[PDB]
Amino acid sequence: SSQITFNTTQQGDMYTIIPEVTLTQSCLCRVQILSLREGSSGQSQTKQEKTLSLPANQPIALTKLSLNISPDDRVKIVVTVSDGQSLHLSQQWPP
């Protein structure tokens, strides 16, 4: 399987999110990570794009997000990996 998965842990309301990608096919690809955090205080929105040469059958850590998530907050993280051709993966956190 080629897939995006999320390594996630928590210490109190402190959350660490590490998106990971494994490819069945060695390639060059475009990786986009979007994150959105909304609370009563305010909002944080990140958009990050990188072009990456990636080997197959190896998990790759795509970035590391440290978020502070209270019970009232919303978080959404969308990770996409594509070559504009036959590779297109997309996954959202939380599941």
Author numbering: 3 to 97
Give the published text.
In this study, we report the crystal structure of CsgC, the first among the Csg proteins to be solved. The overall structure of CsgC consists of an immunoglobulin (Ig)-like β sandwich with seven strands forming two sheets and well-defined loop regions. The protein adopts an immunoglobulin-like fold and contains an unusual invariant CxC motif reminiscent of the oxido-reductase superfamily CxxC motif. Based on its similarity to the N-terminal domain of DsbD, we propose that CsgC has redox activity and CsgG is the potential substrate.
There were no gross structural changes associated with disulfide bond formation (root-mean-square deviation [rmsd] Cα backbone atoms = 0.65 Å), which is consistent with the high degree of similarity observed between NMR spectra of reduced and oxidized CsgC. In order to confirm the oxidation state of CsgC in vitro, mass spectrometry was used to measure accurate molecular weights for the oxidized and reduced forms. The reduced protein had a molecular weight of 12,066 Da, however after incubation with oxidized glutathione (GSSG) this decreased by 2 Da, indicating formation of the disulfide. Strikingly, the introduction of the disulfide bond caused a large increase in protein stability, as evidenced by a shift in the thermal melting midpoint Tm value from 66.1 ± 0.5°C to 92.4 ± 0.8°C. A unique feature of the CsgC structure is the invariant CxC motif that connects the BC loop to strand C. Similarly, the CxC motif of CsgC is partially buried and the intervening side chain is always an exposed, nonpolar residue (L/V).
